[PDB]
């Protein structure tokens, strides 16, 4: 009966799947909400009406409606992030991996996919939870949530499109895991939520939101934090973008009711096809429909919550990758190429700075340019290329995360910080892109343990180390072996601010990750933009 | 009150001692038996009458009366094993190291010193328990027991000198630890007895003896096992040696009562001065007064007990050193020298074989000689030297221990076997002696953690690893980290017989330690001697 489980919403039957010369149980595509279709588009989720009979949970569910990246057709490096199942608004499902035999009450980890709040799928190869549940004896859950306009169209003060419903989808999955994970051998008192990019911002947002805090124990944030410049908009800006979406689709804009009626009448792809038109600027690393600072899911501004300690106080483990900007420059900035080392001219450097800091005035652009230009060597195309990578990564990922870690650490119960800088031996992207946004995920999830993926022995070892750090942290609140001779990952403290490199070489400890540039992005540039 | 403890026999006050930039509590010289003096010489121990007032336990006790090695005066390599306190028949005391602060109920380890059952001291520098109690948070006990004639004069059928009383001293200390270690923060349900050479044989003897089995949980045996050829004698041989001792001292030998009266009248040094005269042969690695196979402490023959599973079934960890014979050849075989590489001539090789296997007839000596001679190179003095080292070590330590491990493993609950082959960088003995009998003890007890002892960084790491293996085994029954990425020490199984090297290089696993030579010593030579 291992594969048959009775839950408070009905029965579900899973399937035995092989992994690494053994087997585990998978429960794929379990519904946790009413399908958010028809007149429920844009609305808060409603929990799934209990069902009669047995739910077949042996195959992955549909993916949510989303923009699909077709920039590099036939290229695995990009297509592996696209939906790999049929897309449907009927998409609020979760997946569970349970070791065999089924443990009594063990650690649970819930993965929240990223993708800028406009894309993402629980079903991607690189999110296959079987290697982690197996190797670490944890119950591994992956949830799903509406993205794009379907998840984040915000007409504040409307009850039909209030904003943040994709975050409420995530919370409802977390609620379901709370009420039902015991029946799978999971301990609901020991749930770790973890996610990368917009998934990592999401995790931070559940740390902040009062209504989410009780639904988990600890948290892991990978290349994302809640205060990221791309991860939220104001109530006014969210409303402006919702109106602009209707303007692009020739909607009645006279009232929220008439606008929403129109938008609910459009086919999903009609919304997706105009999604990027609502952005205020020509930009990179900016996404149209994202969480809104509404005074409900977020009681006050993120900064005031972080300053006053208005968040869940627990343990956190988080970090960034070395070359966070390269993916976004490749797709959106002039001069970059998948087929060449992408030496960037002075003129293209200037254009890239403006795309990268689209909200800045000309003085702010001059400040960024001065901060990142080597005036002893200003026409070095390699330095210009690497400088844009640092601008994009520092502004959008690394310095927001450092701001979050420094503010969080003042009230929290323990912080572990990493810098992932291993370039995979089998990477399909060119060398200049380095250690790319999202490319630690395959190590967290154990893909280098699979012989046919052609990683090296050192990379298999790194992946096992990482999975073990992650799962030991989920279980105890400390990535470290309780009494081992291997080098310890030191706590990050307000005073010494230590972090470790994650790579194949012997562990090195450092302090004050990119502190110089983060003073620029976190203190000086905001002040300059606010003054001028 | 950390240093004041109430025990069932009285109050004891200890002392705070520094260790490795911290501090711990030491309770030194606690009595566990009536002083075995006067008419109690040779008698079974009687437990210590409870005392009024507080016992001062801030300094080491006397050492037992024993032969003192003066072969190399002024040389630390030998003198560090000599008694370092005044010698006295009043010597049955134990020492306790307790971490600070005092734990509630933690793992206990009781050290049993070696020294061939004729020498040994709980107070030696290399037995300083403070580094182990501190570094591993265990309550570390060292006991003491009568040696030489005082502990092992055996007139079977006498009640005044019944034999084995040194083993009964050890048991009474184990009984005291059982009844009283809780008051020190020790868990009496989790006591590991460990010892080297005669201490390791002793440990095996408590595994075998019904009256000892309940007084501990697990056991560690270092370069010694109960079936070692030097570690016991027959009831008849023990009686012959007791009579011969009295013959050397012009005693009435007409009856046990008259013999024992005489021997109890002699000063301790009068007994020590003739101790070696009672041996039947010119020999090395043979000691005069040792445990006796009496039908009481040992219900039947050791071999029959090992075959029938008549022993405590638990977990054991044990092993040997690479060059067990060198110490004994240096002291007792012709051609060996502390001042030279000791190339051994054919004639001296033949003399050494006879000293090493003193019980063998000429055919048995020929068999040993053939087994260990390279007849393609018979006058190679280096090969002859190393061959004697192997003969002495294989016959007296390694092959008896392998016999014990193979018989024990058939009934026990888990076996971990090691081969220690690291030569200390600061060893005071010459190079030819290699990895000497007893020279793993300083690593087990943590001396390489002390900067002024001038070990290398690699040796400090090895010592920490070893202490951790040992203490993790005491606590769990498995030397291994429960879920670590460092290489595992595999169980020794009847079928694959795996063991590890203990040294500074990456862990290597092997099988069937010296199996070829041990078939010779454990099966063939006994058969040949029994036939001829
Ligand atoms: C459970 O589902 C297994 C795989 O099913 C596939 O997905 C379902 C939703 C259908 O669309 C089916 O046509 C697909 O092949 C089946 O192999 C299995 O038989 C199913 N079990 C039961 C009891 O229906
Ligand atoms: C406890 O003992 C400490 C060390 O003592 C030495 O050993 C004792 C047995 C005597 O022989 C003494 O002369 C030695 O110096 C003392 O320093 C300490 O004061 C003693 N404490 C008490 C309360 O007597
Ligand atoms: C976490 O909280 C516990 C309980 O108050 C406390 O003992 C511990 O020191 C805290 N650790 C950190 C790193 O804040
Ligand atoms: C791994 O390498 C082998 C060739 O040794 C190849 O057949 C296989 O397709 C490779 N796997 C990939 C590229 O994913
Ligand atoms: C030790 O004993 C336990 C309890 O019977 C058993 O489960 C375990 O497998 C045994 N281990 C060995 C190595 O014999
Ligand atoms: C260790 O070496 C130093 C010299 O660097 C010496 O003073 C000290 O006595 C040595 N310790 C010993 C030999 O135990
Ligand atoms: Mg309509
Ligand atoms: Mg870079
Ligand atoms: Mg692990
Ligand atoms: Mg350990
Ligand atoms: Mg008299
Ligand atoms: Mg040798
Ligand atoms: Mg340790
Ligand atoms: Mg671990
Ligand atoms: Zn209409
Ligand atoms: Zn007399």
Author numbering:
A (entry chain A), B (entry chain A): 4 to 535
Sentences reproduced from the published study:
Stabilization of Torpedo californica acetylcholinesterase by the divalent cations Ca+2, Mg+2, and Mn+2 was investigated. All three substantially protect the enzyme from thermal inactivation. Differential scanning calorimetry showed a single irreversible thermal transition. All three cations raise both the temperature of the transition and the activation energy, with the transition becoming more cooperative.
The crystal structures of the Ca+2 and Mg+2 complexes with Torpedo acetylcholinesterase were solved. A principal binding site was identified. In both cases, it consists of four aspartates (a 4D motif), within which the divalent ion is embedded, together with several water molecules. It makes direct contact with two of the aspartates, and indirect contact, via waters, with the other two. The ASSAM server retrieved 200 other proteins that display the 4D motif, in many of which it is occupied by a divalent cation. It is a very versatile motif, since, even though tightly conserved in terms of RMSD values, it can contain from one to as many as three divalent metal ions, together with a variable number of waters.
